[PDB]
A paper describes a structure:
In this context, Trametes multicolor [name] (TmP2O; EC 1.1.3.10; for a review, see) is of interest since it can oxidize both β-D-Glc and β-D-Gal to the corresponding 2-keto sugars, which are intermediates for production of D-fructose and D-tagatose. TmP2O is a homotetrameric enzyme produced by lignocellulolytic fungi and has been assigned a role in lignin degradation. The reaction catalyzed by TmP2O is of the ping-pong type involving a reductive and an oxidative half-reaction. Therefore, to evaluate and compare the productive and competing sugar-binding modes for oxidation of Glc and Gal, we used crystal-structure analysis of 2- and 3-fluorinated Glc and Gal derivatives bound to the TmP2O variants H167A, V546C, [name] and [name]/V546C.
Residue numbers in the entry:
A (entry chain A), B (entry chain B): 43 to 618
C (entry chain D): 92 to 181
D (entry chain D): 454 to 543
The structure:
Amino acid sequence: MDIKYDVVIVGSGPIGCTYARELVGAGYKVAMFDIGEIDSGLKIGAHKKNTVEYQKNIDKFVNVIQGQLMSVSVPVNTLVVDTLSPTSWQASTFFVRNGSNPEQDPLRNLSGQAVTRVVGGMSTHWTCATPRFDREQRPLLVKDDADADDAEWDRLYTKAESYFQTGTDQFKESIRHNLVLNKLTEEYKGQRDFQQIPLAATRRSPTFVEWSSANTVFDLQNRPNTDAPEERFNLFPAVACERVVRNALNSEIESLHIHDLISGDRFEIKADVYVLTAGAVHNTQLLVNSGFGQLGRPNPANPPELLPSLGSYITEQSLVFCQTVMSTELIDSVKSDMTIRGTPGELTYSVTYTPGASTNKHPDWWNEKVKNHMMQHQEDPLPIPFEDPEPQVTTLFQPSHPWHTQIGRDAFSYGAVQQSIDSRLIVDWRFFGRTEPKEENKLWFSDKITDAYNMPQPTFDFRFPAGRTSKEAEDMMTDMCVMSAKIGGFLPGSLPQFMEPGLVLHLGGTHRMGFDEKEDNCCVNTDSRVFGFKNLFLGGCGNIPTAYGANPTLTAMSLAIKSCEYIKQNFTPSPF
Amino acid sequence: MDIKYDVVIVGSGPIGCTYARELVGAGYKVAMFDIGEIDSGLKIGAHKKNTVEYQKNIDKFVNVIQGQLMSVSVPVNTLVVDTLSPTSWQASTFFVRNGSNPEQDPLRNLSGQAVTRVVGGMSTHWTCATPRFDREQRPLLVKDDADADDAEWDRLYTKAESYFQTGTDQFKESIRHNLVLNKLTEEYKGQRDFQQIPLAATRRSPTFVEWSSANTVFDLQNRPNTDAPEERFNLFPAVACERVVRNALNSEIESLHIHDLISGDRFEIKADVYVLTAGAVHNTQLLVNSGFGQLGRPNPANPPELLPSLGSYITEQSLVFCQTVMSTELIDSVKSDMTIRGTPGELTYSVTYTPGASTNKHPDWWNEKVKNHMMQHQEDPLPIPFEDPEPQVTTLFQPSHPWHTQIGRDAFSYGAVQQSIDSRLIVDWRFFGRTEPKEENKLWFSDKITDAYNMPQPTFDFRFPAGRTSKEAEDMMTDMCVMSAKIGGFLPGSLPQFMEPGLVLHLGGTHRMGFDEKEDNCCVNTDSRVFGFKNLFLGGCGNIPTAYGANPTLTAMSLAIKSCEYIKQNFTPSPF
Amino acid sequence: NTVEYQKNIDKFVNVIQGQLMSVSVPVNTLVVDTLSPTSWQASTFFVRNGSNPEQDPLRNLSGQAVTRVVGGMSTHWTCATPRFDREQRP
Amino acid sequence: FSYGAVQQSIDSRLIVDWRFFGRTEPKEENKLWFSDKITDAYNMPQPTFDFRFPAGRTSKEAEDMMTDMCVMSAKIGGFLPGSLPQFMEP
Ligand SMILES: *Cc1cc2c(cc1C)Nc1c([nH]c(=O)[nH]c1=O)N2C[C@H](O)[C@H](O)[C@H](O)COP(=O)(O)OP(=O)(O)OC[C@H]1O[C@@H](n2cnc3c(N)ncnc32)[C@H](O)[C@@H]1O
Ligand SMILES: *Cc1cc2c(cc1C)Nc1c([nH]c(=O)[nH]c1=O)N2C[C@H](O)[C@H](O)[C@H](O)COP(=O)(O)OP(=O)(O)OC[C@H]1O[C@@H](n2cnc3c(N)ncnc32)[C@H](O)[C@@H]1O
Ligand SMILES: *Cc1cc2c(cc1C)Nc1c([nH]c(=O)[nH]c1=O)N2C[C@H](O)[C@H](O)[C@H](O)COP(=O)(O)OP(=O)(O)OC[C@H]1O[C@@H](n2cnc3c(N)ncnc32)[C@H](O)[C@@H]1O
Ligand SMILES: OC[C@H]1O[C@@H](O)[C@H](O)[C@@H](F)[C@@H]1O
Ligand SMILES: OC[C@H]1O[C@@H](O)[C@H](O)[C@@H](F)[C@@H]1O
């Protein structure tokens, strides 16, 4: 570890790796710090789902997710256990136990919100859905020129899509995918468009998908190295970043204070530029720990000196969920083009079809897979091949259906996985609603209570705003119930429900972007630069100030590409 | 990858790595293949619990375990779901579905048995308890001379313990550990002795333990390298070993058939010595796929050509579990030496002790920690410090209580982790019974059903033997009830129970060791060589032919060490 | 004492549960945070569904209950009638 | 008076219940009192408890009793999963 770098990035998720990729490639001496460790295989910060074992045992991956999602704010527990032995030590009060937060009102929380501390961040476990936001969900980069605004966003998105390797044909020859996609397309013909979820992923084989991650964006190997001899990069895992030091004039950051978790020692790191990409919650924590905003329960009677909007206007999406069991009619349609020569198991059994026949309801790639399945496996009563990938269908947010949708199978299952019903029959439904930014909705940090890293404990003051947010959320639920029924009935144990506020992990607006600090109620400008400070930048979903339904990561990445263009224009790399 | 090695080892668990450590050390050219991949970070095959984050959020680690335990044999599911929508597709039978094994009798299973496919094997997640077996539990390595047998075991264990870095001092200054240990010592005074569970681990810091693993035994780095420029070792991950090829006379192995899972390519690898350390289930799977023992449902009318005892006499331990909530008396005794005045939270409150007083119940370090906790956290009603490590207590197996005991906190929790009761109060109790080896208890492999790697599907025919094993399992239950009540009453949700057969993962005797193939009904000799074959060696818990209650891994290692002594005596390494 | 209850012994528990009314039920503080945003939800754990705001949940006899029928609890009891020995007896 | 769902996979002929009842020391501090403001379903003052099992002999005996039940019951059989040894609600 050196003492001085051109650039220092806090956090090694995909947004920090965006800044790494742009600035390391542009010749800056870059240091990156993460509080978590390299745990993930030889490809540093790669997707954990990319092993042969998780791709043969994809029901198990939920365990990896759960194992690295740690709850942000757990209210004091009031459950009554009144069947302890009389000899056992027993509480007189509901006192603060097990890491809980006494500042947290249980009824105004985002109880599902969680954070991940591993190199690569949450991109080590994510679903990889990278849709663009349309105008209605997206903040303005240009004022007073819609066409120019769209042009700027299209340029940033096309880059971001390239970094992530976003694509929309990786599931094109999945039977289950097309079964679902075709039925919904038909059902909403002239009303709604359905397509594959855009995915940051590259298919390698018919049974393997290489899912994208922070590693894809930047490979996180220290530099110079053989393949990049003139670049300069160091990653320092197990380093808790604690405070950015402000000059007295509140115009420049002078250092970053770090705590090495292995040695236990503390250090002051100097940079020309400081970039915080520690996620929506922890970027906010790090700033409040540094004198930005207001530490403690909000007190309107005392304006903070800096960033009064910090941690207000936070948004989290409502999420509805269910699973369906494929209708008999749809399953029968899978085998419609087949010729079935008699009784299964017995000599009188050929399964054939006519390639290219114009009476055929399905393509030839579909019939050949069904044929070979029905012939290699004549005990099995379903026409869906055993290896066939899950659907990945969406109809994107529009004004007449203002929610995002993901239809298929997500690795994050929410209950014990059922085993009685054949898995090929099961389709998940997740609808995601947008939340109006409101000043009263707040993430703040205690001035007494601390977390397991000794930083001020985060505390939420959150309710879904009345009015449109709440109206839409319920309309969204009914839409899921109506649409899902076209495919099949609900699976008992996965009936239509709202998920725990915040489980969806799409928290935005904790350090929101705008043109003007005061009139837009924001903390950073459209360069992601913190108002008043020359050399401090913030990256991630915390930047997004709008009400959005779709998954925010590609959009945060686009914003980070723009911020890097500013940094490149205003700071010069040190000589090599 | 070469065609030709001195030694090939199949499996990179800690037994594999014992063979590599000995043979790579002695100058042999070694290759190891593992079906799974590297994913413990830059330390290949290291313990996944060695992150600062896991050791701060101890509850979370069970997810990692559950993530990489895949059930060996799941019977066909016959759960009735009769609340499907009438439009959903439903079969009219309980057909073979979702990977289940139609060979498996649900009533004669080890349903909790499971395997792990990752470089470092189960040592990447284990508990690291490494006790010796006493004579009663241990196979003979020398007959008719008890002193020479004790001497050989002592030598081999001692060597095993240096490999794993086993110790009994890492929890010595935990208040909770000492509280439980002292009370148990006092209560059974001169009927039973208690001590710390011997653990393969080194404490780094008051709040961090470096848990040992395969990596501790052998770092798994390709050699030659700057640290070992004369050594020759290559690891090949993502390689499924499928068959060993026998010569016509069944006196030697001629090659190893493998399948590179990333590329799809198949190869036959040549070696002088072939070592199988694929685990108790998979070593057997591979032998049977190579024409040892018998494929398919056991048929005593058709004797096997080779190794007639392969897969019979299997043992797996009974396990009984509860948790307790610490007694008021025990908790009050934590502060026995303190003078407490005034009222918590007021400026008049104080807590003090008399250092060195010979009438103090506890040592100065105890009293200092309690004092600082009670003075700094006057809102907390417990005298135990917040990061006190957990208890790690055992009373080892003896003839008058012939079960192993582990008292404390295990990372493998079995239910939802409860939050109402302060974790500082909770003590886990696991007692492990020994199971008599019986011929009728079998692991066999289907001749038609294959597993997710297209190998013969494992199937169990198992029941705890009547007579001694059963009598002891139920006496062991009563023993856990009786001892645990000395410390406190049962935690609701964790009441005294037998765990699922095989959940404990101490399967033994699948390829058991003995002096004589016929008279001892076994598969390998005391050099772990397969009878008949000059150059084929098996390693692991599969070898242990006795009824044991203690954790087997250290014992299997000690056998691997002896095996390597035989290899050094009978094969010469190739010149560098 | 019906032929049906002594043929279906498992079912009589329902009769017992049906006439045991809880004596003191503390205010409920279970958190249900998966309601639709359009549903009415109050801001506190207010006194709801017949609960008793005087009751400390941690110093209760939560299982205690009463029966208001002619014959009282002798309409459902187990009928066990031991004598007390001296130690137990006033 | 069964306490949970009735299990149907184990033949009811095998199943034996165990209930052990401890004695509780009478203590002035254990009280049943009635609210001067809250009323029950029949317009009468709401009953409220302030109870804990007394430390000392009551509590020691109760734990000794739970242990005795684990010891005695094992002479007849192992525990039925779902009805493991437990204290019931006060
Ligand atoms: C967990 C989850 C998340 C997402 C999906 C599903 C699952 C189950 N699916 C997904 C999501 N995003 C979408 O756009 N599409 C989808 O299909 N998920 C969210 C996505 O995963 C995040 O939006 C994205 O990674 C966030 O990127 P980031 O801003 O770079 O933040 P990360 O949380 O990934 O990484 C931050 C990082 O910094 C570290 N850290 C935290 N505090 C410190 C301090 N104080 N010092 C140093 N380092 C710090 C963390 O350790 C972490 O790596
Ligand atoms: C999972 C677990 C295990 C243990 C404890 C707790 C938990 C939850 N605690 C524990 C253990 N044992 C102890 O003595 N002490 C305790 O405190 N656990 C058991 C222990 O972990 C095992 O006994 C030990 O690893 C076995 O060592 P091994 O014989 O080297 O076998 P592994 O299963 O670790 O590794 C074998 C290995 O080979 C691979 N494989 C499997 N099949 C193939 C084929 N066909 N080709 C190539 N490679 C193969 C695996 O992927 C694996 O790595
Ligand atoms: C419910 C139950 C009870 C017993 C056991 C099993 C179960 C599930 N088994 C048991 C019993 N006791 C035995 O010694 N051995 C066993 O094997 N149980 C308890 C027993 O049932 C009670 O001890 C007994 O009936 C008490 O008799 P009681 O003192 O006569 O009181 P009851 O509660 O039976 O009847 C009182 C009664 O008067 C009424 N009432 C209440 N308030 C008013 C007012 N304000 N005005 C007029 N009447 C009032 C009730 O309606 C009731 O009928
Ligand atoms: O809860 C899982 C969901 O998590 C969200 O964070 C993702 O963006 C979705 F893709 C995913 O379906
Ligand atoms: O199931 C957990 C148990 O697993 C067994 O494999 C271990 O040996 C114990 F150490 C551990 O407590």
